[PDB]
Symmetry: C5
Subunit: 272 residues, 5 copies
């Protein structure tokens, strides 16, 4: 069914904040890309896969948010008599453009944590495979569920509110599985890390867990606040979650990657 | 004739999944490009042609999928009375935008496997020429056939269903020829590879064969399911096939290229 | 509410100057990006974070000004009978696209000054955190206020002029706080700088303060000149402020970064 | 006058092939650019100008074909009652967008052959000047002529068919002059080349001559086949000519540049 | 007032040449950018600022000409009954998009000549400041004047022809001042140049002066030929001037920069 945004009108500032958020996010991820590209070689070659993944995630997210920015602009138009942005006739907005890009982001972000924990070879591949299965199944079960949000929001003539619950709860199980995989990686880092590196790996885990926990809440917003203020809050928290979970996590992880690099004698990592 | 997509209406989610898939694929290939560009020099110079080809394939595929994303958006519009995305008046969608880019992708993907098998010089050129002839003829005979899919789908007022069969079967013969060329290359690698390298080359062949086999099935979909659910399934399997055959194959091949590099003493390949 | 630009008609040259300014600015920041990207490695690794931030700021600002350029073009159309550019029906212009990108620019520009002052590690992080809090709160309180500018401009049927004052004055307090943080950094540079470096750091502070002071004036323009000549002047001073505060500041800071680099023996910085 | 394409209607596949060709070509040249950019340093510095020119030509051609792709899309629209793509009211297509970019391509492609032949300094400049004069005059006399193709095609109400002949024949004279300049360069290579290098230079000349000879035929198509099948054939042969004359020529020339590099002791050229 | 182009109708070829010119120019500057970016490190670090400026100028000019290309396309549409491209209702074309980008180009092009003359440090800064003041005042006084060209062209209902004269003559004075600054730089090169380098610096000055002299003539065209043939000639001479003054000047200057580099022992400059 169409996202709940399609069933609301917006005050100038409601619509305006959302297009600002989509545009900001695109810029953050494009800037993030320039940054990670310019800083990748400072990491020792045994950790540089993580640096490289950050650049990959930035490209994905930049395009994710650019598409949303475009479609938001296309889907609503000003109506002076109503003094509102209102849906246009032949376009419908979808928040599901973000979900499909997560098939890149989620497994990649979890993999770069496993890379900095020191797993290599089959042990890296094994974890990457488990994380990609768990991550893909979490994202595809939530994508199905978010197709039922006019129904859960009680918009008249839409049924299948229970599908929203069922698919979200299944998605939550695969989320717990991913977190257990990552928790086992950071609790068992490889390559005899320092206690400072150990602490920082544990911090990266909880940062991931906290920022990733926002997404399930954004998913449930149609159920709490199916209103234009709800829609604004939802996109606000997606913006915080996106920037945190991808760019800020990339910087924090890069800092741990550099410490490990430097503790293992990489000179570029030590002179910086 | 126009593709079978032009003769159907879509439910919100049907159209929405397809635009998500096209957008996702574009992002994957653009991210793939950043990645291959950032990782090419880690391969020894005798294998770096393969690394370079991966970047070339990513550019091609990114543009292939971007065009489809654009045309999909342009070709259908929401109709609230029908609650469907429906064709617009002056635009018609074509799946044939993908075929023409395959003239780059297919021969390039098969060439980079021959490069990692160790063929150089005329033996590389000879194989590249055979593969490019076989690949170009496979793609152009299938492009002709896919112009007859309203006819094979039984859409009234379209004739030449037999052309779809004839041209697809000819295309299948050139496909078998390409596979025989590649099978002979991976069975006879050059440069005295390890048994591990030998196995991994053989795996790359079967990965290619499996992923490339999906395309003939996507071609035949108008015959099995000329419906909007069929159209969704078709674009789903194209997405799996594209990402597998190009990006995932590029990563697997890069890993064999690095092993060979390292077994031949390239230090960047050994320190990574 | 919509920005004051939406409530005015423009003479050819009024509208034309503004689209020229938006386009110029985009070009400056894109050129700035090529430049900072091509010059970053000339800085010693202990100062290269500053070089990198400049590139990040250029990307942000390029997109900031590109969005404005687009929306300006979209929001008004020529009307030969009136001989004016006049608002279009379904689009409304917003100056608030610039505010959201400042959440990147402002803290980043203040951070790169602290980097060149020599703060590292927690002392860098501590300052970055204070600056990001102070900067985010300054920008978000001013974003709220600029949603009330038809009201402060006295456009009939818009209320809440007092909100414009309240939110602007709160924003000014966080501005003073940022300046105090930076003033303490430049007065206490680290790493035993030369007196030439000391002076140049102090100059960078006052350059920042002067150029950043323009923004509060652009904010208050609806109150002084809610007219199309006022709108032109406002965008003129934003252009001066943007180019100064971001690109010219980046060059001046790079010059101090190079002096410090060279005084610490970095050869690339000495041979240049 | 408008190009002959404007005076025809297209069957789905006629229009569809042409938009596929324009899009393919854009992708080829963008991929070509990534490739030449990633491979330029493998050439010895005395031949790297040729490598660099290839990248320049790829940018030119990518934009040449992108513009055509855009204008083709804009100029015709589907008409279900006619079952044809037909001209739109306010747009007219032009094949002359390709001509103007040739002012870059033609002299640059001929110059990079002279660079690999070994001419340097004034002897390079002298040849570059003659080639640029001969090339500019060939392209501008053919551009004038192609403005008379509805007239030569016999579209009623268009006169000046003789202008098409006159300007094409003048253009052919400057073409012969260019070929004589290049033939004198490849017959008198500099720097004591191998007999293998000598042969390969001669091959590059004939490859250039053959591929460049296609263009005069595409020019004369309005005279032979002023029909929609003629228009398809013309764009097909332009595609072959463009890819051959620019990308394939770039690869072949790069291979000669590398041989010369390696025969002169450049290690990157020898290890590859 | 709107530029004189807005008051004319065009024959197919008149409009078609201008869109070809705008598109060509964009491609030249984008190719120029790839080229200067790929060749900058061949210059000794004491001259590399000039190399870097060339890349900056290419970005500026590419965007300058792209905007014009866009607006030209948007501002006029085909009218089959008139057989002309004619103005559209809600868009008006402006040649003033080029002026604002000159605020980047002009001072940057003059600065890179002063860099290759050997001025460094404050002597460079002093000249850069004088050139930027003189250049900004020349461009802004000419921008004002070009807002009066329907008046000087005698289009009925437009007054202020004298403003066109006054502002153009003031602009010419600042032009003479810039040329005197540069003439003093090339006559007093620094760093004990060769007599060959001295001659080549003098040549670069006269090349600059000749190519820059075209712009005042393009400015005065509305006064000589306020017709569609005049508009074509004007854009033709702008194209020659742009390509000469920016790209060709960049290549000639790079050649002097390399000679100086090599005469001072930079090995990359000597091996090339
Ligand atoms: C929108 C894209 C944003 C990316 C830019 C991020 C800037 C981050 C500023 C945060 C300042 C506080 O935290 C600071 O982070 C930077 C960047 O990781 C760290 O910097 C570290 O890595 C960078 C390269 O990755 C090195 O140039 C630097 O010498 C090194 O110390 C500092 O050790 C830390 O004190
Ligand atoms: C608008 C977009 C702007 C993007 C800007 C991005 C800037 C990102 C800067 C990241 C700086 C944060 O850097 C991170 O801070 C946390 C703060 O607890 C530190 O964490 C510190 O405290 C935690 C507390 O439990 C400890 O477990 C950890 O060992 C310790 O180091 C990380 O070691 C450091 O890497
Ligand atoms: C969409 C863009 C593509 C992104 C690609 C990212 C791939 C990461 C997926 C992890 C898969 C697990 O398998 C892992 O693959 C990576 C990437 O080839 C390999 O990594 C290998 O190559 C990379 C770069 O070429 C080196 O930095 C690394 O040191 C080396 O070991 C690991 O040896 C392997 O264990
Ligand atoms: C959706 C966004 C994009 C995500 C992109 C992620 C790319 C990740 C790449 C994964 C790499 C997998 O790595 C690949 O795994 C297979 C698993 O059988 C290995 O294959 C393994 O089994 C086969 C037989 O089954 C053996 O012949 C082979 O020797 C052995 O290694 C490959 O030798 C290895 O290179
Ligand atoms: C729109 C993007 C604009 C970016 C281009 C900026 C060009 C600036 C020209 C200003 C000329 C006067 O000031 C001049 O600045 C340049 C650039 O910082 C300085 O140049 C210094 O840094 C650059 C690299 O960062 C080195 O190549 C140079 O050798 C070194 O001296 C000069 O020491 C100074 O005299
Ligand atoms: C719109 C296009 C923009 C194109 C690019 C713009 C290029 C910008 C070039 C910036 C040149 C910087 O030039 C800057 O001048 C100031 C002048 O006070 C110098 O500052 C000088 O005076 C101040 C104040 O008395 C002293 O405290 C300082 O010690 C001294 O160096 C800076 O050391 C120098 O870096
Ligand atoms: C869409 C643009 C894509 C261009 C990609 C080109 C790939 C062409 C491969 C086809 C095989 C032809 O034959 C082969 O050509 C390649 C590419 O020049 C040559 O490759 C040679 O140059 C490249 C770099 O320029 C080196 O990485 C390689 O080690 C070297 O041998 C081989 O010596 C030759 O045997
Ligand atoms: C649609 C995408 C297109 C991608 C294209 C990919 C690039 C293709 C690269 C092609 C490489 C061909 O490589 C080229 O082949 C010809 C074949 O005669 C060789 O030419 C050979 O025969 C000729 C005579 O016929 C001799 O004069 C020459 O000495 C000999 O080598 C060239 O010496 C070689 O460099
Ligand atoms: C449109 C984009 C820009 C295209 C640039 C192409 C420029 C080349 C055109 C041919 C000009 C003929 O004149 C020739 O110029 C080239 C390039 O400056 C000079 O070449 C010089 O610089 C280049 C590039 O830094 C070096 O690789 C070369 O080894 C060196 O000698 C020759 O010494 C000169 O004889
Ligand atoms: C549409 C695409 C455009 C691509 C453009 C490519 C540009 C190619 C570069 C042009 C090369 C010109 O190269 C330039 O030629 C002039 C010709 O007088 C030479 O100038 C020569 O004659 C003058 C005559 O007064 C002397 O003062 C000078 O000392 C001498 O060298 C320059 O020293 C040389 O650097
Ligand atoms: C759909 C994508 C799922 C990817 C799963 C990869 C599984 C690999 C298993 C063997 C390591
Ligand atoms: C009427 C609502 C039906 C929603 C179906 C959603 C299916 C999504 C499939 C994703 C692949
Ligand atoms: C949601 C944005 C901030 C994340 C905070 C994470 C805190 C981790 C604590 C250990
Ligand atoms: C809108 C963007 C919000 C970003 C919030 C997180 C900022 C960095 C937190 C760092 C914690 C250490
Ligand atoms: C009526 C259908 C005819 C289809 C012809 C397709 C030809 C494709 C050429 C490439
Ligand atoms: C179609 C996507 C997955 C490809 C699997 C390839 C298996 C190769 C087995 C040997
Ligand atoms: C949706 C895209 C599906 C991609 C599937 C990737 C398969 C990876 C298999 C790796 C091990 C062979
Ligand atoms: C068709 C598009 C062609 C133009 C692409 C843009 C090329 C930009 C290159 C800029 C590189 C800057 C230098 C960065 C490394 C130092
Ligand atoms: C044009 C916009 C304004 C730019 C102002 C540049 C200020 C340079 C000051 C140098 C000290
Ligand atoms: C109406 C006759 C066509 C005239 C064409 C002129 C072309 C000029 C090109 C410059
Ligand atoms: C010496 C023979 C040269 C053959 C050139 C072939 C060109 C192929 C594309 C047309
Ligand atoms: C904006 C115009 C240019 C300003 C130059 C300022 C120079 C000041 C003295 C160094
Ligand atoms: C009526 C014409 C007035 C033109 C105004 C001048 C333009 C302002 C430049 C900034
Ligand atoms: C003496 C030097 C004269 C240089 C003339 C350059 C003209 C270029 C085209 C305008």
């Amino acid at each position: 069914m169409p996202s709940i945004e399609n069933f609301l009108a917006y005050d100038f500032w409601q619509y305006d904040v959302i297009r600002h958020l989509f545009a900001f996010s695109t810029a953050v991820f494009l800037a993030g890309l320039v940054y990670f590209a310019m800083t990748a070689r400072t990491t020792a070659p045994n950790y540089r896969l993580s640096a490289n993944i950050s650049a990959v995630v930035m490209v994905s997210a930049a395009l994710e948010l650019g598409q949303l920015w475009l479609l938001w602009n296309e889907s609503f138009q000003w109506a002076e008599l109503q003094g509102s942005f209102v849906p246009v006739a032949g376009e419908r907005f979808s928040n599901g453009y973000r979900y499909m890009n997560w098939l890149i982001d989620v497994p990649m972000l979890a993999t770069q944590l496993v890379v900095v924990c020191g797993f290599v070879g089959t042990e890296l591949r094994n974890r990457w495979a488990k994380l990609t299965i768990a991550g893909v199944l979490m994202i595809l079960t939530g994508y199905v569920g978010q197709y039922f949000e006019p129904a859960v929001a009680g918009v008249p003539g839409y049924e299948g509110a229970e599908q929203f619950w069922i698919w979200g709860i299944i998605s939550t199980a695969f989320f717990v599985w991913m977190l257990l995989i990552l928790a086992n990686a950071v609790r068992n880092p490889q390559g005899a890390p320092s206690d400072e590196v150990r602490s920082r790996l544990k911090f990266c885990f909880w940062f991931l867990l906290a920022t990733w926990s926002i997404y399930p809440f954004a998913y449930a917003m149609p159920l709490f606040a199916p209103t234009a203020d709800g829609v604004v809050v939802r996109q606000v928290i997606y913006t915080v979650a996106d920037v945190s979970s991808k760019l800020v996590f990339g910087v924090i992880l890069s800092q741990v990657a550099l410490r490990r690099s430097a503790e293992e004698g990489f000179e570029p990592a030590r002179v910086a």
